[PDB]
Every structure is written in structure tokens, then in C-alpha cells.
Amino acid sequence: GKSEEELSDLFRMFDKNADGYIDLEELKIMLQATGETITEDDIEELMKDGDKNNDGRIDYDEFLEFMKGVE
Numbered sequence: 225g226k227s228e229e230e231l232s233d234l235f236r237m238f239d240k241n242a243d244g245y246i247d248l249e250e251l252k253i254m255l256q257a258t259g260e261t262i263t264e265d266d267i268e269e270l271m272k273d274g275d276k277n278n279d280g281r282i283d284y285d286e287f288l289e290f291m292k293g294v295e
């Protein structure tokens with residue numbers, strides 16, 4: 225369930241630069257915050273499949289997809 229209700233927050237929950245776009249520079253900070261010591265295959269491997277735009281970040285579209293009610 226949850227719906228876009230939780231997804232909306234998640235986006236910001238992940239956004240630490242208040243820009244409306246997540247980046248790798250932040251991702252790592254997200255992991256180290258929830259448990260560093262994470263292989264590099266978890267930062268890119270995750271972003272890659274979450275970077276349909278291939279810009280090095282996430283959007284309100286791709287994010288809403290990869291963020292199908294996470295956390």
C-alpha cells in the first residue's frame with residue numbers, strides 16, 4: 225500500500241540538498257548514515273538501474289519507479 229503518499233516523502237527523505245534530485249555524492253552519505261562499509265557495487269549498481277536518464281542522479285519519474293514504496 226503506502227501509495228505515492230510515502231513515495232513523496234522518501235524522495236525528500238533521500239534528498240539532502242533540497243534540489244529535487246538525488247546524486248551518488250548523496251547516496252554514499254545515505255549508506256554511511258544507515259551503515260557505511262558498503263561495497264562500491266551497491267552505490268553504482270543501485271544508481272545505474274536507477275539512472276534511466278543516465279545523468280548521475282534520480283528524478284521524480286525514475287525515483288517514483290525505483291522507489292515503489294521503499295523503507
Ligand SMILES: COc1ccc(C(=O)N2CCCc3cc(C4=NNC(=O)S[C@@H]4C)ccc32)cc1OC
Pocket residue numbers: 238246251254255258259270271273274275282286287290291294295
Ligand atoms: C537499514 O539498512 C539500510 C538502509 C538503507 C539502505 C539504502 O541504501 N537504501 C534503502 C532503501 C531506499 C534506497 C533507495 C536507493 C535509490 N536507488 N535508485 C533510484 O533510482 S532512487 C534511490 C536514490 C538507494 C539505496 C536505498 C541500505 C541499507 O542496508 C543495505
Ligand SMILES: [Ca+2]
Pocket residue numbers: 238239240241242243244245246247250
Ligand atoms: Ca539530493
Ligand SMILES: [Ca+2]
Pocket residue numbers: 274275276277278279280281282283286
Ligand atoms: Ca535519472
